[model samples]
Target: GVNKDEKDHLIERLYREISGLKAQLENMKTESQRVVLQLKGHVSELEADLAEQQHLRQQAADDCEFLRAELDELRRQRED
Candidate 1:
């Protein structure tokens, strides 16, 4: 029932819509990649920070242990 002109118009409209959707999809893909890369860089930075903190904590523990040993030695001398 539709005329040739109407069919052409509908086809043109559909083509434009499809092109627009394709462009939007590409933009989303690029943005998603950018966010993921930034998150990975942040994760690496946090991992390095955690490593440094753990090293300092271990050093503190070792120092405390050495001081406790000296205190025990003094206590033994006092008891003798």
Candidate 2:
């Protein structure tokens, strides 16, 4: 059987070990949350940039169509 002093020391050691484990778990959780936030930020930025690119492409297509119509009009005028 252990003496009272030895039992007290063992209890203190167990408490310290449990505290250390809990601290490490908290650290890992914080790191994981930070990484997830960064991924979401990057995805949002890319989505906005893609939307802008698509709008510009559509504008260019419309300009090309207008130019083609103007050219056909000129050709018809010359024929007349």
Candidate 3:
């Protein structure tokens, strides 16, 4: 419309709004990157937990076999 000072003020407000929105976008980008790192650490910790449980399972199997041989040897000695 037939405006001069009011029109210039409108453009100033638009640029100010744009600057704030751009700053907010940058903050979200940083937040996403930080979130990704945290999940990466959590997954690695779970992997180590899995490896430890596997070790425990294998140790149990070994002990069972050892006890089986000991029991057989004891029975044979008593019969002989």
Candidate 4:
């Protein structure tokens, strides 16, 4: 009876902490489900990155070929 106040306080803390975290845990479970859609968003970007790199490589290749051809013509002119 003398420690009634402290006893109620400890018991109250145990109940609220359990239920509060339980509340937070359920919301996190749903949020995690929603996050799945956000990452097959990942698949789409993989394809986009691949296509961009493909085009970038081709463009560089074409430009280098053009430069080589121009230099070849200049060398022939100088030789003649």
| lDDT for each residue of candidate 2 in 3-63, tens digit (9 for 90 to 100) | 9989999999999999999999999999999999999999999999999999999999999
Give the per-residue Cα lDDT of candidate 2 at 50.
100
Per-residue lDDT of model 3, residues 1-80, tens digit only: 58988989999999999999999999999999999999999999999999999999999999999999999999999998
Pairs in clash, predicted candidate 1: none
Locate the minimum summed-lDDT window of 10 residues in model 4. Answer: 33-42
Over 4 Å off, model 1: 74-80
Residue-level error in angstroms, candidate 1, position 65: 1.8
- Provide the TM-score for each candidate, comma-separated: 0.75, 0.85, 0.77, 0.55
Superior candidate under TM-score, 2 versus 3: 2
lDDT of 1 by residue, 1-80 (tens): 55999999999999999999999999999999999999999999999999999999999999999999999999999999
How many backbone collisions does model 3 have?
0
lDDT of 1 at 40: 100
- Model 4: pairs clashing at backbone N, Cα or C within 3 Å: 39-42
Better of 1 and 4 by TM-score: 1
Give the Cα error of residue 73 in candidate 4, in Å.
1.0
> How does model 2 fare in lDDT?
0.98
RMSD after Cα superposition, model 4: 6.0
Question: Which runs in model 4 stand beyond 4 Å of their true positions?
Answer: 1-33
Q: For model 3, what is the alpha-carbon lDDT of residue 78? A: 100
Per TM-score, the best of the predicted structures is 2
